[PDB]
Every structure is written in structure tokens, then in C-alpha cells.
Design a protein around this ligand. Structure first.
Ligand SMILES: Nc1nc2c(ncn2[C@@H]2O[C@@H]3COP(=O)(O)O[C@H]4[C@@H](O)[C@H](n5cc(-c6ccc(-c7ccccc7)cc6)c6c(N)ncnc65)O[C@@H]4COP(=O)(O)O[C@@H]2[C@@H]3O)c(=O)[nH]1
Lengths: 185, 179
């Protein structure tokens, strides 16, 4: 039950998003860094950072949560004709991570959108899922996504999953991403 | 408590509930002096999960006419995330017989891809059952969201090398019945 739901969303996240964008991402980041960002310490990192809040709380504005996360720019758009929709575009947003009034990191950052479906399905009676089902579904989504990416040809050190339990006044989202960014080289 | 339920709720929560409230107004912004499209989104639900990215590949009598004005929304850390819809003309005897906003349900293409990947654990018999569950679940969601139900028509069909079936003729039947 909680397995089959998470399993389906994780695969849909891969087939309809990650497998299509991850192959070209490093070229899009490289082009951006070469032409638009000649800051020797302000380079966009080479990986998509995907935020997996395990409570499934996904704000549509990622900057609002944390004064130390500021929207910088959009990467160059990627467009595809998909199921009779001409030029279905994929956009990715670059964010500035601030630490002690200084820029500490710059990366392509987003939430995993499917967690918003797990939240909704816990809220609507017709879906038939409790809040304890949603936590199990969030965990199994993360584990299934990690398992897909481990054997995926399009995952070439170009994707990092960031999972955390904090929904909070003692939690810094910028600090959470900065710890992952700094661990890599 | 299955794959189709998650795909159905994702289709509603992540697409239909956000574009259908604005669709009729986007039409107007297309319906200009030089521009007779119906004000409903036509969603094709092929149970075989055979979803061509180009609708003209399925039936040569469906031809791309134009894109409707792009819808943008800030979504889950992505600002200016665009939602795009295509207008198609339906030919009858080489001449336009109808125009509508037409597309396949994208999640059925995921069920198809999932049936191709060994790691997904999904047989071809599992895919048909989940295709059917996807359609049934989406319909029950929209039957409790009439703000969305009056703005889209769901067309679920099974195509057994069956030359007796014309997708253009089937959509034209629904368009003329509506009117
Ligand atoms: N982060 C990011 N995730 C993406 C993007 N694409 C796709 N996924 C995610 O990959 C999984 C599989 O995608 P599918 O294609 O299989 O199923 C879709 C499709 O049927 C229909 N649908 C959805 C969109 C759409 C989806 C997400 C975004 C978005 C953009 C930025 C941040 C957050 C979300 C924008 C649009 C869509 C569209 N723009 N035009 C026509 N139809 C569409 O609704 C279904 C559920 O959508 P979902 O729950 O939002 O997220 C989907 C889904 O979880 C992307 O560009 N960005």
C-alpha cells in the first residue's frame, strides 16, 4: 500500500523529469558559469540539489522560509514536445546561500514536487491515507529514488538528494544544503 | 494503495487543479480578431498507455495549429515554471472539421516506461490494471471537483493494428455531441 504509492511517484519523478534533465544539466550549468557568472568563488555547483523534507511540507517559495536563501537566476530553459503538448519547458532556479552576511554557496535547488502529492493524499478523505502512511510513503519515495539513481546512466555525479525531518525556528535550510555542498570536494 | 492512485492524485494536484481554473481566460487571450476553439481541455486516456509525443503520429488527421498562451507558476523552489497547452485542428476529407485543446494524460506514459524498466517490477498485465485504475481514480477525483470537471473531457479508449479506429473521428464525435 504505502510501498506501491511511493514506488509509483519515485518512478514518475525519474521517467518524466530526472532522466530527461540530468543528462544535459552540467552543460547548462557550465554554459551559465562560463558566460553569465565569472565569480571565481561564486560558481554554480555541478549537481541538482533535491530537497526531500520527510514531513512532505513543500513551500512553492523556497527563499521565503530562510533569509539566507536568495533567488539569483534561472538556468537556460530546456524544452520538449511531450504527450501532444508542444514545447513543454523544464526550468531550474539557481539560489545564493548566505552564511554570516557572506555568500557561502550557489547551487540549482528545488523540492521533489511529488512530496506535495503525498501531503495532499494525506489531507483529502477520498485518497484514503493517514499522516503515518505519508511518513512511510516519504521514506520509501527517498529509498526508491536513491535505488533508481544508483543504477541510472543519466546520474553522473549530477544529482544529490537532501533528506531531513525538520519542518521550525532551530532549523536553517541554507545550513542544511551548505553542509552537503561542502562535503563534496 | 497502488501506483495508479499516486499518478491520478499527482495529475490532479500537480496539473489539472492549477491550469483548469485559468484555461477559459487563456482561450480569450488566443480568441483575438483573426482568431472557434471550445473552452474545455480534451484529455486522451489510451488504456494501452501508447502515448505518442506527437499527436499527428497517432492520426494524420490531427494537425498542430498553435500553442495557447503559456501559464507560469512558482512551484517547489522553481520560479517561472511554465504550463504549456497545444491547439489541434481535426481534419475530415483533408479539411478542418474542428479545433480544440488536446493532449494525452502524461502519467500513462510513466506507466508504459515503468513496464519497460526491469527495476520497476511492472509486468504488461500490471500496466493494463493500473491504466484502468488511473482512469477510474482521476474520474472520481474530478466528479468531486466540478470547478475542474466542466473545463475538461476525459476520453478513455482501447486500440486493439486496428484500422477501424480514427482518433480524429472519435474526438470530433465528442466535440459535436458537446455542442
Ligand atoms: N521540479 C519539477 N518536477 C517536474 C517537472 N516536470 C515533471 N515533474 C515531476 O516529475 C513527475 C512526473 O512528471 P509527469 O510528466 O509524469 O506527470 C505530470 C504531468 O502529467 C502533469 N504535468 C505536470 C507538469 C509540471 C510538473 C512540475 C512542474 C514543476 C516545476 C518546477 C518545480 C516544481 C514543479 C511544472 C510543471 C506539467 C507541465 N509543465 N505541462 C504539462 N503537464 C504537466 O502533471 C503530472 C504531475 O506533475 P508533478 O506532481 O508536478 O511533478 C512531476 C511528477 O511528479 C518540472 O518541470 N520541474
Amino acid at each position: 500500500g504505502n510501498f506501491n504509492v511511493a514506488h509509483g511517484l519515485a518512478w514518475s519523478y525519474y521517467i518524466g523529469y530526472l532522466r530527461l534533465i540530468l543528462p544535459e544539466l552540467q552543460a547548462r550549468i557550465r554554459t551559465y558559469n562560463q558566460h553569465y557568472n565569472n565569480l571565481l568563488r561564486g560558481a554554480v555547483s555541478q549537481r541538482l540539489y533535491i530537497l526531500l523534507p520527510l514531513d512532505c511540507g513543500v513551500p512553492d517559495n523556497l527563499s521565503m522560509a530562510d533569509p539566507n536563501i536568495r533567488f539569483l537566476d534561472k538556468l537556460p530553459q530546456q524544452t520538449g514536445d511531450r504527450a501532444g503538448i508542444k514545447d513543454r519547458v523544464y526550468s531550474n532556479s539557481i539560489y545564493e546561500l548566505l552564511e554570516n552576511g557572506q555568500r557561502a554557496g550557489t547551487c540549482v535547488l528545488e523540492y521533489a514536487t511529488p512530496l506535495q502529492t503525498l501531503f495532499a493524499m494525506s489531507q483529502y478523505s477520498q485518497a484514503g491515507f493517514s499522516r503515518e502512511d505519508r511518513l512511510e510513503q516519504a521514506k520509501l519515495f527517498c529509498r526508491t529514488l536513491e535505488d533508481i539513481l544508483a543504477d541510472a546512466p543519466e546520474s553522473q555525479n549530477n544529482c544529490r538528494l537532501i533528506a531531513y525531518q525538520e519542518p521550525d525556528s532551530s532549523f536553517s535550510l541554507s545550513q542544511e544544503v551548505l553542509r552537503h555542498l561542502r562535503q563534496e570536494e
